[model samples]
Target chain A: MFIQEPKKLIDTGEIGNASTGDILFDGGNKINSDFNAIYNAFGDQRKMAVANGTGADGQIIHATGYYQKHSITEYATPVKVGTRHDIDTSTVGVKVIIERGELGDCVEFINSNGSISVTNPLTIQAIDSIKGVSGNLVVTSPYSKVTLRCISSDNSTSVWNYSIESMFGQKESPAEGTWNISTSGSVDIPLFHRTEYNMAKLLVTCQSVDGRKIKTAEINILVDTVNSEVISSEYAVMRVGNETEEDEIANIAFSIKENYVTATISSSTVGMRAAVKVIATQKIGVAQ
Target chain B: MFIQEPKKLIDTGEIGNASTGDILFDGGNKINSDFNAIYNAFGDQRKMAVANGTGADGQIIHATGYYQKHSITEYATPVKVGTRHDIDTSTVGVKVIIERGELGDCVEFINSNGSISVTNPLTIQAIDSIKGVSGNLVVTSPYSKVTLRCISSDNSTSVWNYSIESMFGQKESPAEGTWNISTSGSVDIPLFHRTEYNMAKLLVTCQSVDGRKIKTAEINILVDTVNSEVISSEYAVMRVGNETEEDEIANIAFSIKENYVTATISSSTVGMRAAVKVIATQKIGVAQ
Candidate 1:
């Protein structure tokens, strides 16, 4: 029977003598505006067994997802916005398509235990398009991911498209940031962005001001890889470059690393560059 | 909640604003005589959860079989008409006996799907005792069977007697009617009744009215040993005869048989002097 929510019309006496088969809101009673509107709005919620629509069978609707009234038929198979049809029957396989503008905040799911759970995955797609193939993707399962494609006609430049931030360059991050290090044996700079998988790409721009500086030794970039871990000197070698403004011609290149990025100079003129710029790129995950 | 019938004051609006836990019937309200009597009589029917009962736990009753106020304590085990428990849990075995007197007619069970089934098994025992080792019994298993025994205060004779008629003396033929035979060939007289278990036993009586006949040729009673299939007619014979009407006596005997009974008048001045009488008995399964 209706699990009669206390505030609902059924229990509030707004809908007198509520029982199964008893009409809660026929939509004709303007006097019960509160109940009429609230229940009328049920057409938009992805819940089950609501009588908002006249199902094909003229019985309670088993609509597991939102109903946009795409079809007037009440028992019409559920088809609506931000709805997951396979939530009830997981093994049957699922395909969730959110072909609308990005939601402003996290979506909440009520659990069987009466508790709530929320998910805030990176917007699968942006108003326009974001860089990185992973930027516009939400992981729904270990083996699968859902792409929330944005189809906005307003502000077409940024709002009409979207992309993911992955190694594919859907997103752009060539420099972590500009940092000053005069006499430095080694300096660590965290990649401002990491992939949804926690890996990042960085571009270090090193340039020397004085052309007559001491012969350059070498420039090395070290990466900790894991964002959750502390930046340490003992890390995987990301890239090595000896082309210093003082020792050689102007040169700039990007290195792929993870977690934190560290720049090391072996000698004064050899390792020292006029300006060092680090850029980081990441593919954001739901949790991220 | 209570499926409050239309006549109940709760449904009739006589008791407006009635909620659960409110008294449905007070018996003192003469205006609601129908409701009061209905609720008062609930104790007699073994349905569950009627608040009319002073059942323990102040909750639903597990009233199993039937009881007619046989005990005062509430929550006491059901002591009524044929009881069937374990309808909930099949693992537990059950045995119900109703031997007082014949139920008016077919006992009825309304299935959730709206159908009815019936049974008429004999009572296990009388108020005090019935004759058979297996008194009025009720079996709820695939291969189980119940036998209701008859008891009387006469010789306790006819009023308190019973037996099973069968092909193999274990069970009886389906029909409860007459049999026919010819002048000379071997005539098979199938004791009409069975013990419901596909098995039975019978007594065949033959007496020569003439009184002056060769101590009747052996009245051999051949029995089919097994109650099931392939009936092999190997049997034990009992003789009841009087050659000179005073050839020393009156005799009688009992033998078990399977399928049907075969009577052969081997030779005769002997066989012609007799009038045969056969009585059939049955255990009477629940199917009636």
Candidate 2:
């Protein structure tokens, strides 16, 4: 029956499955698919808000406190790490489901250069923040942060809430609660880019409940594609009299970064054509 | 200073925000286009995962958790009630990430009927799941669900540190994290759908380090879209395109039920159309 008010042990990027018994994994090889491990349940209209991206793995924000270094609870689940590359960029978007809901909610957008804008103007009522994504590259610059919060559409809070309360202090609740099971279908835990350096630590403004208590929850994170990322290569044929195009940049280690995508037009071996590199990236702000 | 072990709370959605001090908002307005309030940091390797869209308001899965629900908390954040419409389909597959010179993982396809299948044995490090999406809209038979998980191509846990885990209960962690301030942004909090004979509640899930610390996080849940929710033509469009086209059911006096997507097909006209109920949802089953 103990809850960590200030979860200090859960360092960013580290996994911590709360248990009434004990810590299972030794930072490796443990159980991750059991509710007894790490799980949380939400009720009618609740959502967890975190700076979304691959920036910080264990970023913790308190309603009142200084940023401190923390520890990560090695999860029993297997974490996937590798070089991710996307090819097709026709139609794409990422969608996440809020497992719960809180009253009086709104959303805002932030950028690396410090530009803010209220993208959505909906009244908080139901599940999580309904987000949309199409084309993006790096984890920096453009930050499409969709939060489940209560305040002004301008990302401002009350004096008392801010001054008296810590950064993430004091959540509001109605005496009654409506539990929601299997509510969030597919949540998009957005992927990262090779050049993108960002992190997202989740902080669901929460508390304690009573009946039908859920000791754990299962988060279904999915990464999808609009189309198949592709690459096209061609050969050249020409007689000595026709054309003698010679190039040596064929085997150059030219792999697209997970966030960056591109294609190369190699020089024709026998034809009289010069090679070219057609690079494409989601980082390009606007397609002029 | 009191932190409970990560447990289980698979009952609703979550809500919360990321801040050290100063300004604020309820964990309702989702991750917007401002700055990554909690996720905007520059690090080659972050301690936290982030939330950001690639192109146009892209959906991002910043940080995910397998949480637990115990009691109640503070009131800066308010929540609603709802339930989740989960569907189990047999047609499921996934591509996975593996280290170079290593055999990739295997995937299990879970049909709607709960049948399971093992397919696509990956080899030699790279993005194991490249991808494709198609048509297979069928109600599968009931059996054991098909799932895709990280497994040794040779069915061994030699390279991976953690043992195999299921998406249902495993705790997941991001590769990294960081910290920075966002001018404005949006966070998404989806309220799951649910109902009782005489009452209906929306489930809201909030993130917290301590399962008991309820005095933080100013949250407010909102309504993104309604399910089986009644509508009024004079108030809000209910449906589009009805019988005889002119006799289209535009507005009507009705009560919203759990799991039904409230809608009015046509954007211009508020007529009636065939409503597609939320039978169930299952996300992130990458395939061969």
Candidate 3:
């Protein structure tokens, strides 16, 4: 014997008028059930005007196209974008756990509460390594947002590509200041707080306090913040007609180590004053 | 002591079955009202498959998921994305006017038309200075797009951060050409139209025009278009043998002023010829 499923809207095709009440009930019930189905399907998928937070771990984040603000309150919490499995990373001390998702699943996360503690920075770890991120990725800036799109997935793991989409309240102006150097010394110029790649332009103008001799140098340099390596640098210097000696202008050198660009001024001439100004344009997203 | 509002579905629980007509009408009206409430809340917030244009000035542009094609018919027009106030730029001679928006609100604009006009370039200006843009940002290429995110807001003024996300149909190839310079003269290499930050790599191969006594020079240069200044340049020249004279190869110089890279060859050799090729990768969004 075969079992049949419940009658639906398609099944009530040619019933007689005597069964009008039965048809009405069945049609009304089917419409009500269909409405419920639509509610279940679209209630959580609606686009929200503002970002919403996931209340609990392992819950399916249903909103797409809108940002979801994830707070790092503990060491780790499980999370998934759209409708996918929520894998917990609490055991591994991973701060923001990216659960496995299907291919093409995209999600954006806003760093709501600023950077995590310096010792234990908030890290978003994938089961497998992120496409371009070396090792694990950490969030060190407040109001920074990242968008991740899944490229591949399997039974146990998934690969993701991420873009550091934006850094809020950080692009108003270049990080710049002028330092006065009177003697042979080096001044450390700090890098921008939330930049991954920094392009800094330094200008040095030197003259005797009496303004008799003058020289100016303009240098442009690019740096990789992750490795603290100077990618490239170029400089040009000009001086008054034979008035400034080579040693006086050549002594002002710029070097990069770690996060700071050190400007060293070394000269034999007494009363030589050099003013150095550094203007840096920083980028916060993926490595270009 | 107090009067209640209109009786809804919740108020019909205790009524007897004798008054079925009143309950039916009240319940039907309540359901219709609830359906209308949902429609009103979500009808305009739906994500569109493609962008739609704001038909006229001071219109709230809907459809956030897709791109909008705004044609520049005149010098200026009014526009807004999402449910924000539409501000006009007609009187100010601004091509694209960014209206005030709430914090965290974001929008993207695509340059549907090619660069506005060389005489009057398409300018996107904020009421205040755009976070990292100097003076005003102009759109000079076709199929280029920019994304703006509001970072701070109050009455009358709001701050925004912008990103030049992508240039459609522009990244496929680099602007390059092999020029045969047989005489002591200068050639102007035109810069890419839409690029603000241009990193151009130039390769120069020089010989006697018969392919002997050859020398090659690789030069990497960066330029700031807004100021028409050469930010930095580094070059390395390699000679095949002692056959290449100092005056022959040393006279080749690259100078950038305005929107072109001028390659000046001032060699004394009679039959000397240099072929120069420049490959430039340009960025279109906010200044970085």
Candidate 4:
């Protein structure tokens, strides 16, 4: 029984019987009793062939540990390649998964997913850094960077919203003063103005006066209205016409209802005739 | 008789007994390898010792292949560090192993899983993209930004309930005179209000000679009230006195429901003097 530390190889010449329990380190590898190849001291395994030589070339077993470059692939089970994207969510040429609590690096490729990809070999980085959580995992690149489907949120550039209107000339002119009145009574008018055709205004005339002068009247004025945005009255009012001395123009008011400008007038006389004009501005795409 | 492809180092110099059984390399590394160390063109190996040319130093032999700033690690038996957080996941620092497969980087870190993990430093990325079936694995994240545990739908920004009271007073004033009526039916008033005092209106008057002539009423107008938004009616035909219109104004109703504007006013004739009033709004810290 030659069980020893730093075992040494001895030339016993030829033998009448081969022992099943023998170990040897030869041809850059270690062979144990079970015929398993220890390609490296790190316990990485490999295989070997057995052959015999006459006289000087007795029965010899050999193994080799060569450094060959390879690729990456998918796991049998889907995993988050990144914090958000996963093998299930990605459709890139390469993708990957980290089996729960893996000590470090050990991968298996799914040829079914695809074949070797990328012109340059990818890098596998922060493998242990992948330190996955039951909640999430973030995969990045750099270990020889042979990433198959390594997903990474913090380590990646943002993806564009292919959706939304065209990025080119989808000009949204300012709805400044633009409004509508329908079954919806009042509509929403945005406050910003933008686009190729930029300006928008609402011009309303009630009799011959700028409805702005009507104070206590609830019927009209450029007011504030935005369900999602806070806005105020910043309308420029231009009124035309005067009140008959007897018709003592009581209160005239102006308001922005939803998307339109409404004006109402009160007078000392019941049906005095007056003509007033009013205008409001509205809408925009982006804030200047 | 010597025969080989790559010639090795041999010191037929001081020995009378030449053991024809030894190996070595043509480069700096050799293997007559009385086994001081294995080094060179192929694999790299080393020795630790102190010597003065007089005797071969006796010490443990070592081999080190350094790539770069890579860390190395060792594995214990296998187990998850916690529901969440380790180096028991990490013992002390870096250790490494490289397992060669059909291609590049493949690493398994579980020290105990038995099937995976290696004694050497394991590489992470370039492992399989871990192709997976439907059986899922959810992931968690810790990035530059601490996002709200915001549960989102369709992965977007427009959350379903924009009903939260304040994103900066994004609320609009109630349509001043918004009101409705009914008997015991339920109603829904908004949880938030846009003004200090909001007013809801309802009007009814019993038949009187004033139904055709008198036009001006005030004081004690069938009042059932509270305070908040506002209160005032400048309309003519006023009813100053009392409940003379009880018969004419059969039954009067009041109540504030959920989001709907509601209250019931019932009676018989026109121009009666039983003015009924109701108030509803709420209190919020910020609104104050």
User: Lowest-scoring 10 consecutive residues by lDDT in candidate 4 chain A?
Assistant: A158-167
- The positional error of residue A268 in candidate 1, measured at the CA in angstroms, is 5.5
- Give the runs in model 4 whose Cα sits over 4 Å from its true position: A1-92, A95-288, B1-288
Cα lDDT over the full model 3: 0.45
User: Residue by residue across B187-213, what tens digits does model 2's lDDT show?
Assistant: 221123422111111211221222221
What CAPRI class is candidate 4?
A: incorrect
Worst 10 residues of 2 chain A by lDDT: A160-169
Error of 2 at A31 (Å): 24
For candidate 3, the chain B TM-score comes to 0.34
| Candidate that beats the other on TM-score, 1 or 2, i.e. the better one | 1
Cα TM-score of candidate 4? 0.18
Reference-based lDDT, residue A226, model 3: 61
**Model 1: per-residue Cα lDDT over A67-126, one tens digit each:** 221112321222223332112112222222233344331111111111111232212333
User: Which candidate model has the greater lDDT, 2 or 3?
Assistant: 3
TM-score for every candidate vs. truth?
A: 0.21, 0.16, 0.37, 0.18
**DockQ score, prediction 2:** 0.02
Scoring the B chain of model 2 against the true B chain gives a TM-score of 0.16
